[PDB]
Design a protein around this ligand. Structure first.
Ligand SMILES: O=S1(=O)CCC[C@@](O)(CNc2ncnc3[nH]ccc23)C1
Ligand SMILES: [Cl-]
Length: 166
């Protein structure tokens, strides 16, 4: 495939220091994962950045989804359009530790990835969602069985994740 410069961690997990928006724009993958919240309010982090790159079309689509279906569950997901970034966007809600949500729900969140053969994704629950990215990577490796290409925004963190992996 067109994913370039990823370090192989396991049979099915690959990692790169990259902005997921730029990776999506260049590769145009079948599935890009959004680090969503239950309301699909794409304000910041991965979600705000993906939505900005769609010129707010992701938010417009998401507001119609919520008006029809109500909020997602923490640990849940929905498939919506990938707009100009991907064929599909898989919106996945990891627990927000800053809100006291159960970190055990991170495994449930990653299980959604197993419904898709290949994904471009961030580390769920990390960044502004408050969880330890080292833990998020371990849960990913131990939960996802399909092929996942992880884009880590921060270089300092990327290097720490690689160095501490084996
Ligand atoms: O500070 S972090 O590296 C800690 C680990 C999770 C993060 O990677 C999640 N946020 C992003 N990841 C990838 N591309 C992105 N574009 C815009 C935001 C963004 C941020
Ligand atoms: Cl973030």
């Amino acid at each position: 495939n067109s994913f370039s410069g990823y370090l192989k961690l396991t049979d099915n997990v690959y990692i790169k220091n990259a902005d997921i928006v730029e990776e999506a724009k260049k590769v145009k993958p079948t599935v890009v994962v959004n680090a969503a919240n239950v309301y699909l309010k794409h304000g910041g982090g991965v979600a705000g950045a993906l939505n900005k790159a769609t010129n707010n079309a992701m938010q417009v689509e998401s507001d119609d989804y919520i008006a029809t279906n109500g909020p997602l569950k923490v640990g849940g997901s929905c498939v919506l359009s990938g707009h100009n970034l991907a064929k599909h966007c898989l919106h996945v809600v990891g627990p927000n530790v800053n809100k006291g949500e159960d970190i055990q729900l991170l495994k449930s969140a990653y299980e959604n990835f197993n419904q898709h053969e290949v994904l471009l994704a961030p580390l769920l629950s990390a960044g502004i969602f408050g969880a330890d990215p080292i833990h998020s990577l371990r849960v990913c490796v131990d939960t996802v069985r399909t092929n996942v290409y992880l884009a880590v925004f921060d270089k300092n963190l990327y290097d720490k994740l690689v160095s501490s992996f084996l």
